[PDB]
Design a protein around this ligand. Structure first.
Ligand SMILES: *[C@@H]1O[C@H](CO)[C@@H](O[C@@H]2O[C@H](CO)[C@@H](O[C@@H]3O[C@H](CO[C@H]4O[C@H](CO[C@H]5O[C@H](CO)[C@@H](O)[C@H](O)[C@@H]5O[C@H]5O[C@H](CO)[C@@H](O)[C@H](O)[C@@H]5O)[C@@H](O)[C@H](O[C@H]5O[C@H](CO)[C@@H](O)[C@H](O)[C@@H]5O[C@H]5O[C@H](CO)[C@@H](O)[C@H](O)[C@@H]5O)[C@@H]4O)[C@@H](O)[C@H](O[C@H]4O[C@H](CO)[C@@H](O)[C@H](O)[C@@H]4O)[C@@H]3O)[C@H](O)[C@H]2NC(C)=O)[C@H](O)[C@H]1NC(C)=O
Ligand code: 6ZM
Ligand code: NAG
Ligand code: CL
Ligand code: ZN
Ligand code: ZN
Ligand code: ZN
Length: 779
């Protein structure tokens, strides 16, 4: 810890120095390890950040913050407006857009550098609403590649999102699950302010700067000390870009605390928000003028990205737990835009999580939060598989806060809500030689950017949650060539091999090209399964799970909906293609006083009364709680036809999911913790459906030319409907709302089932990857 060393010729050095030697890098202040003369040498402020006519051609002065002398360009330390003020050049923003067909890099550069320009709390709508006061940002957006919005991860907080951006991982995977955290194993607490956040034990996965370095690509600093002004951060980046070939980094990051800091105080659209936006734009202009005078403005790839948005949240819109609970002082609450509940540690044996959940469940007619046990949270959130995530979670309504008591105005804005909320959406602009020219791309999730960033730098990405190749349509070149995964298990195609009389399943029945549009799903794990054909549907029957892994069927715009005849209500027929030993039985359901069953292919949509008998095959049967049957029957009887009629037919792929450890991955048979009473029949934790049709709705789903359109859900298989506060009413008043909350990507279903969809289409694989990452938000 020898502070007696000097920073002379070491200001913002890139090589990290360990003890005893003192540091001169930007993180030295944060770790309290700077050399005595760091602030004096490295953080000059004299005469500001802009050149003036009088300073042009000046004699170099060490005291100045930046220089206006003739040697400044070669030294890489001019003020960013030098050539404009002194050499009569124009500002980058005043030039017309010229396509960058190839990188125009100075000799010596191996690849175009990447500059990640990150802005905190920069909401998607600021692009259009603030465009008139942001001309530099408007030029980047209009002449580069932009998305109308980028979806952040849940929680829509800073640390979980910036760390997702760096790693391509969900917060539950990288460990930064919140701005405030408590690890029970460490018995320590992570906070926005404190020295505990500096410990490396909290930060999982592999961030971009580590990915780069491990592959021999030099990485600049991503985290900046708060005391370093934005102008100095920009000048430091430009100085590093002026270094010799063998020392020059290829990846850089800038960070701005704004517009977030002002957003919290004045709300997202507070009149006070114009100044911070003008400021961020001025900083962009400085970077761009700075790159132009270094002849790098047509060589560097720039990413303008946000971490989350900002909502209108006041203290009048606060919900108090003291209005629901008796023991509010006996609980710890992570409050605000989300809620995480923990018991207070000492002499609190009467603490019951079930009582806290029951007392927070549908108590006020206009209640502005909903409690959940973390494993019951919508799967799309990926917010469960981490010990730092408390079991009790409160999903708070947009514009609302949760607090313990009136004890605990100042703020007009906040963020942290569900990542599907409009106000939480952020920005994405890609500008440079590798991005497309004047191109708009569809919205995407920030988990996807890490792979793009690796691709832009020629790196092999570490394993992450992005879908590599899903964002190829953003790039002019340097595209990753994705390949479909190899199918592990081949299917069996059984014929009639069993006699009806061989089946003693305790079942009774008064029975005396079109449906698989995109090829069969590929099974990517080792298992035994049969493909079963029928007039109205096709399935992939699992011998181990004793039910289909998938069921595929097409419903045309004009399909007729029929009812289950009175005499077929309890009909279950044996399937002569599957062994009685590899079949389910009715006696297990009769003996399970809490479990009933349902069917994957809906009997309501049979093409004829004769065809309807196939829907009652024991091989189309799945276990279902009576409460869930209310949801499933309404989906099958009413909603599938509604979608077919609205989308000009639909192709449906339904099936079970098993995720007992809530890690978002397919369970192995040993991970299943519930079976139908005294049977080998596993109980699914969820049920899915993938509903596909033609993007061009003038074309029927079964005769589609061009892109596809999809919507999917992962419904929780619950023994009650406590999640839905109106569940006592008719299903037409609550089932659809439930389903919209549990909307999913095809990719989320793929991880949970070990299946690979859309293997046989007329579309490019890159386009199919984009389709698999699509989330239908209803927002
Ligand atoms: C989102 O994408 C994620 C990434 O792919 C998916 O998460 C992965 O899931 C799998 C399966 O669950 C899991 O695999 C297991 O790994 C076990 C060992 O785990 C430790 O090591 C890995 C790898 O470390 C390497 O990488 C890191 C940087 O990322 C580096 O620091 C290491 O030094 C090491 O380097 C080597 O690789 C890198 C490239 O990655 C090279 O650059 C380098 O040169 C080296 O070659 C770590 O990632 C794990 O990290 C977890 O734990 C630490 C400490 O607690 C946390 O800080 C960290 O945040 C992370 O925590 C999260 O995951 C754990 C589970 O791992 C959760 O419990 C937790 O709640 C968090 O969610 C570990 O330190 C291995 O034993 C195991 O083996 C089993 O299966 C095999 C069959 O293959 C059997 O033979 C065995 O008997 C075992 O049963 C298995 O391979 C990955 O570890 C996990 N990765 C991460 C980052 O979480 C995720 O599923 C996906 N999400 C969805 C929904 O799809
Ligand atoms: C002052 C303040 O609120 N914080 C929290 C976030 C932060 N982030 C960065 N760099 C970021 C980290 C990162 C991660 C990915 C991509 C770009 C960047 C720049 N630097 C400092 C700070 C400090
Ligand atoms: C739950 O509500 C009941 C009835 O209002 C009350 O008796 C009980 O103490 C409450 N429990 C908690 C833990 O808040
Ligand atoms: Cl938090
Ligand atoms: Zn933030
Ligand atoms: Zn904030
Ligand atoms: Zn699992």
């Amino acid at each position: 810890t020898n502070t007696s060393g000097s920073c002379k010729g070491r200001c913002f050095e890139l090589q990290e120095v360990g003890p005893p030697d003192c540091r001169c890098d930007n993180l030295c202040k944060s770790y309290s390890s700077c050399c005595h003369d760091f602030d004096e040498l490295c953080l000059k402020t004299a005469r500001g950040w802009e050149c003036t006519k009088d300073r042009c051609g000046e004699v170099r002065n060490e005291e100045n913050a930046c220089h206006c002398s003739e040697d400044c360009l070669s030294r890489g330390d001019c003020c960013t407006n030098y050539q404009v003020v002194c050499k009569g050049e124009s500002h980058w923003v005043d030039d017309d857009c010229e396509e960058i067909k190839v990188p125009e890099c100075p000799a010596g550069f191996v690849r175009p550098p990447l500059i990640i320009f990150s802005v905190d709390g920069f909401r998607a709508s600021y692009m259009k609403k603030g465009s008139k006061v942001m001309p530099n940002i408007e030029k980047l957006r209009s002449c580069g590649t932009h998305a109308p919005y980028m979806r952040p991860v849940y929680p829509t907080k800073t640390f979980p999102n910036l760390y997702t951006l760096a790693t391509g991982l969900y917060p539950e995977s990288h460990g930064i699950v919140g701005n405030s955290m408590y690890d029970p194993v460490f018995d320590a607490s992570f906070h926005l302010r404190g020295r505990e956040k500096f410990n490396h034990r909290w930060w999982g996965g592999q961030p971009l700067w580590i990915t780069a370095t491990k592959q021999g690509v030099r990485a600049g600093t991503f985290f900046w000390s708060v005391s370093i002004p934005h102008e100095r951060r920009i000048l430091t980046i430009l100085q590093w870009l002026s270094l010799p070939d063998n020392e020059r980094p290829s990846v850089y990051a800038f960070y701005s605390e704004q517009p977030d800091f002002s957003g919290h105080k004045y709300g997202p659209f507070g009149p006070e928000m114009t100044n911070p936006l003008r400021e961020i734009d001025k900083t962009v202009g400085q970077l761009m003028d700075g790159l132009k005078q270094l002849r790098l403005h047509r060589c560097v790839n720039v990413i303008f990205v946000g971490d989350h948005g900002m909502e209108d949240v006041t203290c009048d819109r606060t919900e108090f737990l003291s209005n629901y609970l008796t023991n509010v002082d006996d609980i710890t609450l992570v409050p605000g835009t989300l809620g995480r509940i923990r018991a207070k540690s000492i002499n609190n044996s009467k603490y019951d999580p079930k009582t806290i959940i029951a007392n927070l469940t549908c108590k006020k007619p206009d209640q502005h939060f909903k409690p959940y046990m973390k494993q019951h949270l919508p799967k799309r959130l990926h917010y469960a598989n981490n010990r730092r995530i408390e079991d009790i979670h409160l999903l708070v309504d947009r514009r609302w806060h949760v607090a313990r008591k009136p004890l605990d105005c100042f703020f007009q804005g906040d963020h942290g809500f569900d990542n599907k909320v409009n106000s939480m959406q952020t920005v994405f602009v890609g500008y440079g030689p590798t991005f497309k020219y004047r191109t708009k791309v569809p919205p995407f999730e920030n988990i996807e950017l890490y792979n793009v960033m690796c691709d832009l730098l020629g790196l092999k990405p570490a394993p992450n949650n992005g879908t590599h190749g899903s964002l190829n349509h953003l790039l002019r070149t340097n595209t990753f060539r994705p390949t479909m995964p190899d199918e592990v298990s081949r299917p069996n195609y059984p014929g009639i091999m069993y006699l009806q009389s061989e089946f003693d399943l305790g079942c009774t029945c008064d029975d005396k090209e079109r449906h698989l549009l995109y090829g069969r799903p590929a099974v990517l794990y080792r298992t035994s399964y049969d493909i079963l054909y029928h007039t109205d549907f096709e399935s992939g029957y699992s011998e181990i799970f004793l039910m289909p892994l998938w069921t595929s069927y097409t419903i045309s715009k004009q399909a007729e909906v029929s009812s289950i005849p009175e005499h077929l209500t309890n009909c279950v027929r044996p399937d002569v293609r599957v062994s009685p030993g590899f079949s389910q039985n009715c006696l297990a359901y009769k003996n399970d006083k809490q479990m009933s069953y349902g069917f994957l292919f809906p009997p309501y949509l049979s093409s004829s009364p004769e065809a309807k008998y196939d829907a009652f095959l024991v091989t189309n049967m799945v276990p279902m709680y009576p409460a869930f049957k209310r949801v499933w029957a309404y989906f099958q009887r009413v909603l599938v036809k509604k979608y077919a009629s609205e989308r000009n037919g639909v192709n449906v792929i339904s099936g079970p999911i098993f995720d007992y450890n809530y890690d978002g991955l397919r369970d192995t048979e040993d991970e299943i913790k519930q079976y139908v009473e005294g049977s080998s029949i596993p109980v699914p934790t969820h049920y899915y459906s993938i509903i596909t049709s033609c993007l061009d709705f003038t074309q029927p789903a079964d005769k589609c030319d061009g892109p596809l359109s999809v919507s999917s859900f992962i419904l929780p298989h619950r023994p009650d409907n406590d999640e839905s506060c109106n569940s006592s009413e008719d299903e037409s008043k609550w089932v659809e709302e439930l389903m919209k909350m549990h909307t999913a990507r095809v990719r989320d279903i793929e991880h949970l089932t070990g299946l690979d969809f859309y293997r046989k289409t007329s579309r490019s694989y890159s386009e199919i990857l984009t389709l698999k990452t699509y989330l239908h938000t209803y927002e």
